[PDB]
Design a protein around this ligand. Structure first.
Ligand SMILES: [Zn+2]
Length: 327
């Protein structure tokens, strides 16, 4: 019965004053300095930056008041370069709650040989998504702390963050050389009872919706509404964007240049959501089409990021998450 609850779940929509509070509650400059910059480093699996990125992400979550439970999902896999260790970071509020809304991105960076003394740091791909998730945890900390309180008056639902390792191919993208962390974690969750002691249901049944952020940070992104089974949630993002715009709460933003689009997409994008989608998890895939102009080039750097765009998207995402969780 409970695994169907997601199908009927409704947002608790925020009023104008709440929207203004949320818009003012997030700081793009603080995210930039404290959450984003430490990640703008080479961080392919096993590199010093991989370890540093992991420490940084964990550290930033630990300093918060909300009752986050951190779990490092570490495993080995063969790769074109030989065996490597990969570590997914999972951060969960109320780990025994039957349902979670799940926000995710990948924290590894793709390996490139150094080019004119330049290194690939994957600013949009996906350092910015990581930082947006960390800034969301910080900005909403007091609201999220309320989830620590037990009540029959609300659904058994909370929030999880996943930072996937090993999303990127080491060489040429193949089913075997990509998605190392997400293929591993989806298989693990599929085979794990949830809630503990349950018959039938797995941790995948507990995932209300996977909201996967990827390739965010370029100016004027356009996100297609990819999947019918999450289209109603996508439409909430459009509505939040529109209302925030109308309230004067977005920066350098026009209705003509809005981010969340009516149209869908005519191909199939491979990303960390694939192992989840194929097992039936609803996915809201916040990846733009087209990809950023700088995609997989040395120009995917801090210079080419757009502050206002990320700030706007932070506001929209934070409203979405609060409305989903009825906070
Ligand atoms: Zn990439």
């Amino acid at each position: 019965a409970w695994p169907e609850e997601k199908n009927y779940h409704q947002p608790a929509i925020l009023n104008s004053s709440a929207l203004r509070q949320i818009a003012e509650g997030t700081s793009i400059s603080e995210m930039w300095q404290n959450d984003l910059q430490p990640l703008l480093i080479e961080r392919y699996p096993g590199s010093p930056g991989s370890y540093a990125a992991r420490q940084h992400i964990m550290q930033r979550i630990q300093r918060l008041q909300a009752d986050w439970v951190l779990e490092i999902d570490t495993f080995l896999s063969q790769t074109p370069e030989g065996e490597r260790s990969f570590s997914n970071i999972i951060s969960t509020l109320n780990p025994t709650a039957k349902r979670h809304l799940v926000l995710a991105c990948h924290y590894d960076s793709k390996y490139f040989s150094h080019w004119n003394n330049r290194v690939f740091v994957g600013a949009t791909d996906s350092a910015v998504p990581c930082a947006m998730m960390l800034e969301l945890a910080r900005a909403l900390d007091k609201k999220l702390l309320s989830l620590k309180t037990v009540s029959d008056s609300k659904p058994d639902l909370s929030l999880q963050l996943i930072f996937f390792d090993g999303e990127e191919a080491f060489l040429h993208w193949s089913p075997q050389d990509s998605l190392y962390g997400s293929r591993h974690l989806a298989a693990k969750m599929a085979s794990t009872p949830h809630p503990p002691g349950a018959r039938g249901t797995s941790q995948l049944h507990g995932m209300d919706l996977l909201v996967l952020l990827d390739l965010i940070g370029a100016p004027n992104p356009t996100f297609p509404n990819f999947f019918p089974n999450s289209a109603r949630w996508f439409e909430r993002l459009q509505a939040i964007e529109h209302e925030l715009h109308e309230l004067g709460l977005l920066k350098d933003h026009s209705l003509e240049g809005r981010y969340f689009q009516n149209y869908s997409y005519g191909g199939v994008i491979q990303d960390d959501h694939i192992p989840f989608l194929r097992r039936g998890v609803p996915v809201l895939h916040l990846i733009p089409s087209p990809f950023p102009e700088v995609w997989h080039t040395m120009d995917d750097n801090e210079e080419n990021l757009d502050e206002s765009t990320i700030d706007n998207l932070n506001k929209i995402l934070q409203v979405f998450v609060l409305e989903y969780l009825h906070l």
